[PDB]
Amino acid sequence: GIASFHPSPWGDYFLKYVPCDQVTQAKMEDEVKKVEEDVKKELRKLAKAVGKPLELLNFIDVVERLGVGYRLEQEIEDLVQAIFDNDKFGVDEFDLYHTSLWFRLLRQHGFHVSCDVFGKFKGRNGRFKDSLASDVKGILGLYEASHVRTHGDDTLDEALVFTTTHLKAVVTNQPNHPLVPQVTHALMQPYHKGMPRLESRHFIAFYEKDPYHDKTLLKFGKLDFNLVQALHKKELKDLSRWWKDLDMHAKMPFPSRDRVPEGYFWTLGPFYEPQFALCRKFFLQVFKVTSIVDDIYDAYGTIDELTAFTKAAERWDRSCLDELPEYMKVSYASLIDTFEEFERDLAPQGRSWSVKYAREEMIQMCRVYYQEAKWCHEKYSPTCDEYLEKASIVSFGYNLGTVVCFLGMGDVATKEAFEWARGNPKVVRAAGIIGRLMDDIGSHHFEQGRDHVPSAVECYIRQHGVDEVTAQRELGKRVESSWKDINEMMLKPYMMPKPLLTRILNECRIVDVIYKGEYTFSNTTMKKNISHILTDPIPI
Amino acid sequence: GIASFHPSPWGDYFLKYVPCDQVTQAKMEDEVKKVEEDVKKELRKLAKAVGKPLELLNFIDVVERLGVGYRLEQEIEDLVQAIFDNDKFGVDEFDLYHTSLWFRLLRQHGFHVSCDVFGKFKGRNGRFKDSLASDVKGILGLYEASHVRTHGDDTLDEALVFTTTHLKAVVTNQPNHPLVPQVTHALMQPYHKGMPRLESRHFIAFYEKDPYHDKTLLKFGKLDFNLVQALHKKELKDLSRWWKDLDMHAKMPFPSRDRVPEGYFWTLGPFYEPQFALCRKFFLQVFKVTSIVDDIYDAYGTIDELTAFTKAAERWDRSCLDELPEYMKVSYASLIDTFEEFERDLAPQGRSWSVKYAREEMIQMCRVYYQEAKWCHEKYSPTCDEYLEKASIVSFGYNLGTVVCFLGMGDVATKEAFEWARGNPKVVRAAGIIGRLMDDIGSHHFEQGRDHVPSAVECYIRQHGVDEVTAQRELGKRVESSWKDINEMMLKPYMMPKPLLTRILNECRIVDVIYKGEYTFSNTTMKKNISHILTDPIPI
């Protein structure tokens, strides 16, 4: 009632999930496999067809945006490779939508195809023809393709401005145009920058409204979505039990109590496909443990108590439990226990040796937390570049996030990849810059800062002597440059194996979804995003 | 960053408030007092004028909705009384807007005028003429008047359905109509049911856009608003200091740690005018201690520890500090300390004897909290009427709230009034029913309930064997009937003096504003509502 600050939007809904029995689950599995083989047969048909470039382009695009391209991964990559090798594929004669589709697909699969294919859509000024604004479909396609841009894609930089202006006008002057639901959604969330699972859920609904949609592809996307959603909800029921058990170790509740759905929503970002259950188990659990130690560093304890907790984290041993103040013991024990559990989970595969790399990242998290605490306790005001480089990029959590993602991926995560991520590569820093800058820009305005608690916008304002609007614009430029670094990371040849780079790309995407500021955690948008992918199956 | 559940939308903004110097504040005070005398002279002019009902009606309505009728309280009441006695006022000839204005104004001032005044607006069917929908202004006025309805006002019940239908059509078919902002706002928040401070702010903005507005009235409202806002910001600076000092007693943060702005918003509901500073101090402080003890009963402690805390609260003595478990001691001490501070604040006027009644309500709160905890641990499923009568109406906080409101009101709040409120009168029960039922209806849906945690919708569903929609509708009817009891409370002859009933009416209004689900504490709507009345002055 009054003074009640205990929101429980979800209650026991996820704990009360009842999975269907094994006979049923295997029946649904075989149904979806039957339609998968149907899709693959039709795909083979389109590949050997003599002309017909656009049909194969659209078929590939639809299976990808329906969220079932993972069930056809190899088949698609080969096909796109063939398209890239066909130097007489006919791109010169495509309209805006299909030129944009060819460009976007090729860029997303690592092929560094040129922006010159867009030249025929420019006028004498060197700008895109405003006459193209009547081709709503093609403007939408160009808008979506422009978000794969890297450094040196000035055409795509201007294409984003051009398409944004015309798409906003479509929303405003043509409210009843058949594409307005899609245009409005894309303006809020470009597909390439959204969470794969959630954007595929929305595209399934859009695709059903397309009069020319392929019925078997729509059925494939719906059936696989419901199959994969049952796996998610079984995982979330179990992980809810584990999280609740951890919460009941303390007498007073942690802030993260009842926040398993939000944490698991986060966890679905890097990976939603069935084969990453172990990945999702690790990411969720580290998420909870991180939240718990974050509570320690955000409380009203002394800087000596925070020093002791950081040192004890560096030693990483239960002997430290007797030396720590009472209120820190549950969090410290959870650190030791959870990573021991990771070791047990990886022993049958002979992979326990890797837990070490995640443990070090966790120790790093404590160190940067300590630094942030220190800056506040000793009333030091860093510059923006100092705030980022010394604590805040890493304290966002993606140096730990990337290593924990690799933790569950099996033989592809070699020791060499763990050491690569441990050395703070440029792309992991980019993911962290995106997250940290969006979190800080959206958290509060300048006049709502906390004295002596550094933040990116306040640090930029005090360092460069500019106003809030300017600081927001320059930091937004840093976010955009980091996004271009991420898109260059997906261009061949790959630094690390693609399954590993894709985790970092997805970490950036889930941040674009959660920190859509213009709230951050546990608000109405988060509740609706969870409702979209984790409550009911898709009808029929 | 990731796993960060520490939102601080406001930071140190209210702590860093800098008041103006005493000479400046006295200057602004004298300016507003001068324009008050101007307004009063003009009002005297309108009263001593033959056959000008509509000009005087509108003048009174505007000074009230500008939020400065408290500077003319007696002068306005007398005038309205004179209007009720006229009997030749000419109401028989008013159009829809002015008939609605006359009816609403008289009802709000205790005069039980009849619904028959609306007979000329009905057709042969006995329903309001749909032809009236073209009089947007009059439809809006009738909509606003209909929320003062009591038992036996079937005309107003039909008026709400009629005007809602047509106002919704104006919003959808006439988006650019000049009244669309006002209609959209009224459809979300009826004036009569809103928080006076916040609704007067919105009306100040609306009134400036009326080409026929009185420039001096607008200046009166703007200047008084900025003057009273300086008082609120000084009070909130001080109370933020007190609240932060209390919070630093605990090592781990309470859920209510950074929630002074939301709590003070709550506190402005019952009273916003300068004379209730002490009231606001008490309500806010009680709010905070209530939140602290609510945390104890919501934590994962044993039913034996909650038994002990409840018994210790019944004893109300610092000696219990030695008997309680550690994590309860700061909460218990805050109880003892805060109510002692109330004794000190009321000693100079010789009223410390009244703190007793508030202490009793606080003890009742622990009891009803205990009952709710007991039901959960004994896995008991109460009946809906049982859920309400035995814990949940009182646990919303308004038996305590009404007694704490009276605590700061001085000689008007007699010992007899405290004893009237201690005995659970029907109108305090109505306020609690409104609060509890809106909170429970909006908190979660049926499938998101917590096992063994009673809540109104779930209890009604399991008691009566109905579905969620029906339980929500029947409970909404209970809320509506309680609102009719509240409107009856403001009809003469008054049970208690009017200043005391008005606190109860305002408690219901602040609940209608905060639990506007269509959804709880500390969300973007609460942040915007605080922004509207507590950040910047009104320009010019």
Curated annotation (Swiss-Prot), chains A, B:
Binds 3 Mg(2+) ions per subunit. GO terms for molecular function: magnesium ion binding; terpene synthase activity. GO terms for biological process: diterpenoid biosynthetic process. CDD domains: Terpene_cyclase_plant_C1. SUPFAM superfamilies: Terpenoid cyclases/Protein prenyltransferases (SSF48239), Terpenoid synthases (SSF48576). Mg(2+) 3 binds at residues 439, 443, 447. It catalyses: (2E,6E)-farnesyl diphosphate + H2O = (5S,9S,10S)-drim-7-en-11-ol + diphosphate. Pathway: Secondary metabolite biosynthesis; terpenoid biosynthesis. Keywords: Lyase, Magnesium, Metal-binding. The Asp-Asp-Xaa-Xaa-Asp/Glu (DDXXD/E) motif is important for the catalytic activity, presumably through binding to Mg(2+). This is (-)-drimenol synthase. It comes from Persicaria hydropiper (Marshpepper knotweed).
